[PDB]
Structure formats: structure tokens, C-alpha cells
Amino acid sequence: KPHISALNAPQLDQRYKNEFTIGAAVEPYQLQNEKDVQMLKRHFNSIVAENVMKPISIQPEEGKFNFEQADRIVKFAKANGMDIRFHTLVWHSQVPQWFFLDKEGKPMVNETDPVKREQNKQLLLKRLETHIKTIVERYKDDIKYWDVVNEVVGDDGKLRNSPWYQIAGIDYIKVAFQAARKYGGDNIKLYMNDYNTEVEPKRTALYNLVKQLKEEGVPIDGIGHQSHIQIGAPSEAEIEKTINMFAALGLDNQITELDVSMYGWPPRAYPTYDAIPKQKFLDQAARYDRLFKLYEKLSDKISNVTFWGIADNHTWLDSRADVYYDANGNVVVDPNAPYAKVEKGKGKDAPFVFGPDYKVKPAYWAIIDHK
Ligand SMILES: O[C@@H]1[C@@H](O)[C@H](O[C@@H]2CO[C@@H](O[C@@H]3CO[C@@H](O)[C@H](O)[C@H]3O)[C@H](O)[C@H]2O)OC[C@H]1O
Ligand SMILES: O[C@@H]1[C@@H](O)[C@H](O[C@@H]2CO[C@@H](O)[C@H](O)[C@H]2O)OC[C@H]1O
Ligand SMILES: [Cl-]
Ligand SMILES: [Cl-]
Ligand code: NA
Ligand code: NA
Ligand code: NA
Ligand SMILES: [Zn+2]
């Protein structure tokens, strides 16, 4: 199993073309990087914007829409026959503050007057509809898959008490899906995206919510499982149980932001890519082998598997790769070991099947084969 250039390796999307599409999250500058471009054309047939289609990127100020960056990804996808996923119409992060300010410029969350609160709810819901309307009216014919809402369920099994819920309640979710369907039509597929969808009580709460919304006529086509996972968790058994229960509701499933971290949580990362022991790459590969075997077994319930990145030289996991140092200045990776200081987000993770030098990793061989 040679460490050959990925540009000379069997195409990943081709290996899985009858099971599900294979996607990657991208930043516009990568479309100007020869290697990244070659990777997208060679191995992927689905693309998503890592950041430029989030609320704050699209409408940073009410009335100021910036589709320039998003357009670059759409244009590239079209020129290369790739499906496109829109990430994301609604989220509590990377969302402009102006959405949640009242007519006097005060946080709607701070309103005590009931009358005033109902007014703010309807105001927020209007802004939500316009945001969604403008985006969907532009891209409805080019983008097939949409993360209509992202992370709206808390890890405590309750709805996430973000400004969206505090101000408008459960209705912000209903309005989001309805507006997307209204302006995009019956052909675009609408998804509720989240992480730790395999963990209780979140899993069942998400399950109950979509069950209830669907029963109320709210248009929801599938569930997006972010899948920011580790080498050992979640177990394949729980991943399977998760996919099955949502499939039972008539929902499509997409693995939307897959990365297999070399670490646990919170992460105790190595400071550089080269410091990561070769054994970790073998463990990671066995995980990828089991993971994709399961994805295939469940192919009639999964339409897409997207990696949150192209190759190891670029991954948001590095922002979470905290490096712990003991009193002697030595790196500490043992989860239950002494340490004196931590340098947050200064280390390096290696989550993909493609290395930082664009050569295939043990994990590539594990999922490209037929065993
Ligand atoms: O300083 C800003 C950065 O913090 C920001 O980083 C991005 C944060 O979002 C990441 O993507 C999310 C990861 O978690 C999932 O649950 C979400 O669905 C994803 O959208 C992304 O990878 C990071 O690049 O970038 C902008 C900076 O200004
Ligand atoms: O902001 C979100 C992060 O908080 C999230 O991180 C997860 C938190 O729960 C832990 O159990 C998981 O291991 C960890 O990945 O990731 C998604 C991001 O949007
Ligand atoms: Cl990133
Ligand atoms: Cl390497
Ligand atoms: Na290196
Ligand atoms: Na990035
Ligand atoms: Na395999
Ligand atoms: Zn190498």
C-alpha cells in the first residue's frame, strides 16, 4: 500500500458512485490552488462551502448580500458536474448580530414587555424569511441539498436556547423550512444538520422534533449527520442505530462534515503533523475501514458522504488541537496525565484519507479497496 500521490490514485467518488456521492468542504482560495483543484476534479463529485455560505458571510449587514465567494464555489461545481450542498441557512454561530436587535437597536432577548416580545418574534421571523428567500431565489436551480437549520437541538436533549429560540421559539425552525420550500420549490432537498446525532439524549430529541415537524406538515427531507468523530467513538453500532431510526421516519441521511480526529475530547494534540506516531494512522485506517463498510451496508439510506476538507494540510480540527506541556516543556498527549500549560489550537490533527503532501494515507487504501 504505497504512499503515492493522490493525483495518481484510483478515484474515490468512482469507487462509491452507486452507493453515495463523495464530497468535500472548500474555501474559495483552494480553487486557486492547483493541487486542491486537481483533488476536487479527481476524487469528488459533491461540494460544500466550509464557510462562505454561512449567514454572516452572505448577509453581514441587513440588505448587504455578498454572493461573490459563494458564486465561485457554485461556478466550479457546475463546471465539474458536482452536486452542491448549501451550508447553512440558519445557525447560532457565524450569524450577524443585527438579526437579533429590536427597532431601537436593543437585544430582543432583553425585552420583558410581552407585547414587545411578540413584535420582535414576528420581526425576526420576517428577517429570516427574507434572508432565506434571497438566497434560495438565486440558487434554487443550482443547489440540490440544503442544510436549512444547523445545530438547533442541544446536547441536553432540549432545543438549543440560542437567540433564535429565545426570541421566536420553535417557530424559527418551522419558518426556515417553509420559506426554503416556498422559494426553492419541490425539487430542492431540505435537511436539519447536527453533530453528535448518535448520542442520547440528543438523538431521541432530534428524532422526536423532526417527527413532530413532519406531522405538522413542515417540509424536511433528511438529516445531516456532521460526523465529527474519533477513532473509537461513536461505535459503529451506534452510528448504525442512528441512521436506521432516522431512515425509519422516511428521512434521507447525509454524512455532512466527516473527519476522523486522531484525538479524544478535549483533544491533547501533537504539535506538528510529523510528530504523530505512525501507529495512529493505522488505527485511524482500521476505523475508516469499519466506517465505510457500514456506510455501504446502509447505502440505501445514505445519499452522500462529505468530508469537512480535502487533505490534511487544511482542517478546522487544528483550531481544536490544543497542545499540553508539562513542567519540563515536554508535550503531553495522555488524557489523564499532569501538565503545566496548554497552547490552545496550536497543534495538528490528521483527519482525512489524503496526507498534507497530497499523498494517500493508510486510510485511503482501507476505503478504496473491496475488503
Ligand atoms: O475566526 C473564525 C473561525 O472561527 C471560523 O472557523 C470556522 C468555524 O466553522 C467550521 O465549520 C463548522 C464546524 O462545526 C460544524 O458543526 C458546523 O456545521 C461547521 O459549519 C469551519 O470549519 C471553520 O473554518 O472561520 C471564520 C473565522 O473568521
Ligand atoms: O461548535 C460545535 C462544537 O462544539 C462541536 O464540538 C463537539 C462538542 O461535543 C463533543 O462531544 C464532540 O466531541 C465535539 O466534536 O463540533 C461542531 C461545532 O459546530
Ligand atoms: Cl478551517
Ligand atoms: Cl506524509
Ligand atoms: Na510533514
Ligand atoms: Na478551513
Ligand atoms: Na475496506
Ligand atoms: Zn508524505
PDB file of C-alpha atoms and ligand atoms in Angstrom, residues 25-27 29-30 50-51 308-309 314-316, ligand 6:
ATOM      1  CA  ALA A  25     -15.936  21.227   2.053  1.00  0.00           C
ATOM      2  CA  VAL A  26     -13.974  24.003   0.364  1.00  0.00           C
ATOM      3  CA  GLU A  27     -12.820  27.620   0.710  1.00  0.00           C
ATOM      4  CA  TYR A  29      -8.845  30.239  -2.222  1.00  0.00           C
ATOM      5  CA  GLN A  30      -8.495  26.495  -2.668  1.00  0.00           C
ATOM      6  CA  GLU A  50     -16.811  25.412   4.521  1.00  0.00           C
ATOM      7  CA  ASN A  51     -17.652  28.990   5.436  1.00  0.00           C
ATOM      8  CA  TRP A 308     -15.037  18.510   6.027  1.00  0.00           C
ATOM      9  CA  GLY A 309     -11.948  19.254   3.978  1.00  0.00           C
ATOM     10  CA  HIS A 314      -6.134  22.096   5.919  1.00  0.00           C
ATOM     11  CA  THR A 315      -8.682  21.154   8.592  1.00  0.00           C
ATOM     12  CA  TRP A 316     -10.686  23.136  11.139  1.00  0.00           C
TER      13      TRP A 316
HETATM   14 NA    NA B   6     -10.980  25.949   6.655  1.00  0.00          NA
END
